[model samples]
Target: PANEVTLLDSRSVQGELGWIASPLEGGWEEVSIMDEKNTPIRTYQVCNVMEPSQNNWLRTDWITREGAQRVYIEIKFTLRDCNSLPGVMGTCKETFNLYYYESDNDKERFIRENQFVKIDTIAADESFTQVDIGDRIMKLNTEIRDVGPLSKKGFYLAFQDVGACIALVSVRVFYKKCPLTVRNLAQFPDTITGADTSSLVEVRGSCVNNSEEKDVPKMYCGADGEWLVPIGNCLCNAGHEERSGECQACKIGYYKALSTDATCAKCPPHSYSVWEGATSCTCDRGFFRADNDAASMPCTRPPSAPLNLISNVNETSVNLEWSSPQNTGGRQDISYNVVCKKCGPSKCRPCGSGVHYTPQQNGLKTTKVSITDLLAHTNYTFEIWAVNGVSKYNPNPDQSVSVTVTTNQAAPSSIALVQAKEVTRYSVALAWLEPDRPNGVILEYEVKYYEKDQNERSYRIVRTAARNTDIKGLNPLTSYVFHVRARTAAGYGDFSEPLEVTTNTVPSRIIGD
Candidate 1:
């Protein structure tokens, strides 16, 4: 048969192929049984004539397997006289019965009950008036008995002794079964057919999930009566690769997108695939891929900060210049933005509307900008930021160069207060406070006076770097008007309101001589 396998085979060994032998008053023993040529062969025998209660059994262990549609047992044995004593009556009436039962027990009742049906019986020669001594030796015979369909996973076969003497040469138990499978291949249910010679034992199979079946997966019983290995028809899916005979995931930092025989690809620069069986790699932090970039291309980062920032400042304006960034992030379209901030003592704010930046602020392609209407002697910060297409992916999108500038000084405003400190017969002294709006550092003060009663245009001027001044060379008893002014590096401011004062009249010369 094409799909037949031996369940149990007893040769010249001792274990009975896991079979059990039970006895009552007598038992079967393993010994030599002579062949037709007088050759002694190892076998099992039971012989006892003194006790009519002598009984014995040889039963197979459970032959348990699925899909066993049929089973059979072939036994070779010889039944003969118990020649152990003279004139032994058991020598001519030796017999045995072959029986089959489906049970889990091998007890006495289960071995001899109705459920254990006898299939055949072999007996020694009976009396026919010929008492030849040579005729007492029975002939060796072979029996092929059908144990019938296996109702359960398996059944048992029992050979019971009915006479006093018997010898068992060999026993064979077999069933019909096909082969199991290898990886990624499986057989259809109930495909292990019964043993047969005419029909081919064919079976269908299927591929597991994540695999592509290229053709029909099937196996056939070969001419040598064995199941052949199934033909390969499945391939690994995406993000997976074949190892040995099974499909497994790709290695880390590798990717695969097609269900072919190709190997996994390594991640590109600035990109990584952390999970096994990943179909694609993602850019690392601070790196990105452009819209037009290929998946296999290396990712790039935004440009570095602009370099070499410089500024020129005047009384009310500043001009800033800078060089392009050293790294363009592997791109050609690079631009810059200028951020202007006006900072006071406590905080900084964006430039107000009055502060004018040349050529705009944001999206400036040029490297230079001029800012006007800036307050004199005030600090202003300028930032030049470099950007490119990939900058959007960066946490800090702008890389910048920063510089601070303070505008030059302008003229101070008019002095807020002025007063005459002392008046002499020929001189007057004047003192003034700082101006209301001192646009810059005050460098000096100017004092002016005129003879009020004389021609009004008759004036004399005196200068001082301090906030106070004294006038000399004035006529006694003269009325005069005085004015004060402040100056910075940008030049003098308007004079303060004038204050008219009379010089001390020449007092009578009453000084002690």
Candidate 2:
């Protein structure tokens, strides 16, 4: 091995080194040969050069690199030629090409256009008759900075004849043990383009969703190269959250509201969540809701008004019928109230007569009720409403429409004149005029009588379809007084003025027969 502690760093080395960095130009000088005291036997390598062209090839080199730090490109050299031809000296053609760098075969055109770190001709002026060097590299496209696609198992450079009469003695190729550290590291997935010079330990710029919208220091990189960072999410992305070590989506009822949080939040009671990374919960139907961040405000709902109101009226009473409220207003015990008043004239203050109409049914919520005792000819108004057991916030519960109705008129006024006619020894007939004003339908008539001149005031009764009525089973020698009246659905009208009649003095069976 020859040691050329002397390096031609002029245009020769300057033209040979360029990675994806500033063009500070010129390759780093190689270290001189070590002290040879360790080994007794010295090994000598020889190479001869005669022809002008480089076809009859002979290749040799020692190219090995091992480190925790990543190494991108490498080169080694030990050159000397024994053949000489007058001033032709002892030089031939040598061309050393790097292989482990994995420069695939598509850059022939780009290589021609791009200037490479080339070596000056050795035969013309600088010949390596007995020359050697440590390691050197080629001009790489400062734009390309990755070894993943370049080489996974170290680098190799073994082509021979780097220059005229150039000899490669003990150069090594590299594929050794090293930390995962590397020069041109593998490209991450999201990084579609750009240099992969990042070390595995800490990422400088990495973000998930577009770089500007993420605070993610993990997948965060911005092109044209500035790093401003965006709004909304950082620890987790939209529709996805960091559950385990991975970015997992939140479940149905969970959410990740802000960027500072580490995990998704659970939806509160009476609330629901739909999207994966939804920030907050929403109140479902049938309820009124407020922000849960506040302490006192809770979800609530109130019962609706009652429906289907009806008031059936007969002569003396009203049959009030109705239904309960539609909604329970979020409470179980929904009670009811039936308020009523016998309204006076249009807007006057005085109410209907003193007829008090209260319900007897179990609860106000009870749908139907029969108002039994009521004034025959009075107007009544009622309102129905529902309550939620007792009240905490609202005092009076919601109610239904008001209902007003009038009871039928009282029984017809007192009947007209009454007198006995067709008097006989044992029978008599009574007649009465219909009431001047029969309020309701007149159904029938009746007559009642009692002895007029005897101590026995026992009376007899008769029923008839018309105003006229006849009494047949009477004592032949008895005097009778009777009253007649018309009847309607409202009850019998006040009996007509008392009627009087005397039967002829004769025995009923014996005398009449």
Candidate 3:
């Protein structure tokens, strides 16, 4: 092995290497080549290699590999200074090509497949260089690496057209096999790969239920010079079931609060979980669910304010009414409050802050609220407060809107059906029950009458707190038309319908003359 043939020195005929010289004599001789240390060494050279129209070459040996996947082709050459030349082409030039054949030599077919894997152009105008590459033709490996496509195709090399008397020093070929390889593992996706082991992956999906999700597993080199799929403690993904290895839903009324929890949770009281794999519960209609509350309590707040307010106003009182709230907190037992106060003509008074009109009717379950004894000709604010019920903590309640009501301003209703008694020369008596309603308090009665002689008329205003009144100043023997109207602090009311009566006959003959 101590020979130039193995070293690319070309001092001896070599193995797996050949040279061709077209239009030049074929000869190789040992010559003095300058080394980088400025010393001469015995190397290979050709006749006038710097001449134009020249062909001289040296080639590298071949090696076997698994489809040339992990192979490296290395070479070292120099562009020597050329002074004398046969023509004006003053630079060193060389061309390199490769070929592969599955079987023995066939010159014509080899020419047919002569176009080969790689080509290189070596020019001496540039400096000396060395080249090495992984997957030299990476474009060829569309899917897996070059495992077997060119396995049987043996390697070939051709370096030719060496001009300017170029010298060949060294060329080498071998399988680049120092990378990490995987072997002897329990399970592996691929038995062989030349890629970066860390980047190797296997895609797994199409779950048992055929869901639209997938998973990926990485392949790492194990201690035993092999690749392995990992086995460890890991929670199942959200959509997949742990028991059957199938993706599933949690179904209605079930929830999973903690993302990594093993099981689903049922909805709590007054709460509902409707969707699949629901994570939280919501309150039912007409109820409010407070998060994290006492178990015994229904999740709810006070009902909304009462609606549809109305008032029935009278002379000295007002009746307030309201409908129930839109939502009753999901319970039938509901209560309300009726409050009233005499506010100004245009606005309502603030409740329970140094104000007095009437006591608020609290703890009333019915919708109707009655406020009596209101002053006449005054605006009373009637309020209906909605409540679910009262607790010790919540004493007073929520108040709805206020409705203004003004009592009637007129005097009490006119007196009706007056029966007269004690008829005499100039007197009569009358009594009556409460008129349909004392629209207001009666301060007095206005008594006015006229005799048959259209000119004889009398008028008097009698102030008696009682219901009855007496007329004592009327002419005898005359028929008189009589009527009475009531009065109040506001004003006098319209007169009642008339009543007709005749005075006694001359007071029984002029006092017994």
Candidate 4:
């Protein structure tokens, strides 16, 4: 039996229920023999006589098998002439008889109905007979007998000495059938398995739970109760892989949502899988996945900074231009934001209401913006950046391009105040405050003076870098009218109101007065 079963009273003991020898008083005797390895072992030998007509016999105890279709008997024994020295005991004969019988009871008369099985005879020179029964034959000859299908629950085997001194070593009685097993197969009734057979047997089976069959699964039982190579295989389920002959879950950083033989794929960019056997990936922080995108598609982030920001300043207005970002984070809903700041010598502050930027501040589709009402010769800085849907999750002031520009300069305004000081006969001095709006750097100041009766166009002119100037070459008793103006990098402004003053009649004598 391929799957072993306990045969009732199966034993190799001599003179016991496992086996019985005829003529209990003097039937078979236990003797020691030397095997091919020269190791001494116990064996049963005929004890009565060495003549060819002797009736010494050995029979097995009744073997009970309820439903055995067919059985086989395996025997290992050796034969040799009784008279090794031929001169004293005469020539030797070598032959033996094998038989089997079946019955419903343990009655002695049933032995008389035993059927003749086979006879084997060996020549005197056949000490090393070679039999290729799986090449297991050596000094101890081996043989197998098929005891066809049985109708009773009891079986027996007998061996009798005919013409040779026989030595019996071992014996085995078994039925021809496959085993009841479920290796990598679906569940089924055990009653339908382990049937006795000699030809190829087709046993149908299916894939186990959690697996799918790739082909028709079947098992083949060959002759002599042996199994042939099985057919068909199984594929693992979704999110599962085959490892070490079993279906296993996938590892992290990989995903497999479909049922196929392909291995798991690595997670895409801006995504990650942290748990085992993940079917899809999770988007990273500040990243998002769209509705129409596949589960395996990579997630996207906000767009990069705007490119090539440039500005042009004309008088009180400034114009800016730029290009779209190079990488839009794999999206098309792109917009821009512009921030303007007025910069001074040390610090910078936001441009207030006075300065206006066209197209507003945030959510700008165009890449350019025009700023107006800016102060002349003032430096203003602009920052620009692109934004997408994912920008909400991004950090403020993430990434941007910047440019600074200065507005054009204009002439200074009229002087705020003017006054006459140190008026003398030979000269009159004129003083004035700086202009209200110096739009640019102040360069110098100009003053003009003349006689009250003289034409105003005949007035003499004087220029100085200081805010005050002296009108020289004036007559001692003359009355003079003088005006003042300031100049900047952009040129001079209008003159201040004139003031008329009389020079001292005589130069005052300075005596601590």
Best by lDDT: 1
TM-score of each: 0.36, 0.29, 0.26, 0.53
- Lowest summed lDDT across 10 adjacent residues in model 2 is found at 1-10
Model 3 TM-score, 2 decimals = 0.26
Clashes of 1: 1
What's the candidate order when arranged by decreasing lDDT? 1, 4, 3, 2
The TM-score measured for candidate 1 stands at 0.36
- Candidate 3 residue pairs in backbone clash: 49-165, 50-164, 50-165, 183-225, 183-226
- What is the lDDT, from 0 to 100, of the residue 300 in candidate 4? 88
Alpha-carbon runs more than 4 Å astray in model 3:
1-77, 81-158, 161-513
Q: For residues 1-513, could you state the per-residue lDDT of candidate 2 as single tens digits?
A: 111111111113222222211111221122232223332211112233544433222211222222212333323344332344345453444333333232333222222212222222222223322232222212111111113322322232223233343322223222112121111112123222123434222333333431123433333333222222322333455445654334567788886655555566676555667776676666656544423332122345556777756555666776666676676655555766666567644653334355434554334556777766666666666666665543334444354467566578465788768877678788887777788887767767778889997786886777788777668877776678888777654456788776778888654553545
- For model 3, residues 191-245, the per-residue Cα lDDT tens digits are 2223332333332222233232222323443312244454323343443234444
Question: For model 1, how does the per-residue alpha-carbon lDDT over 1-513 read when each residue is reduced to its tens digit?
Answer: 435667766653443344567763347776654445634545777766556565578776565544555566778666554564567764334568788776544343334445777777755344422221321344555666655545665667788775556677678776655555444433333244444333356666766555677777777754234666666577778888776655678799988777864667888888888999887788888789978877677788889888866565556877777898888877777777777777844679866765667887677888878878867666777778897777877736348877665567455678768888877777677888889887766656778878787655586778788887778777778788888887654456889887888889644233324
State residue 103's C-alpha deviation in candidate 2, in Å: 25
Higher TM-score: candidate 1 or 2?
1
Candidate 1 stretches with Cα past 4 Å from truth are 1-5, 11-169, 176-178, 183-195, 209-216, 221-232, 237-239, 244-246, 249-251, 257-264, 293-297, 303-389, 392-513
Q: What pairs collide in candidate 1?
A: 81-91
Candidate 4's displacement at residue 261, Å, is 3.7
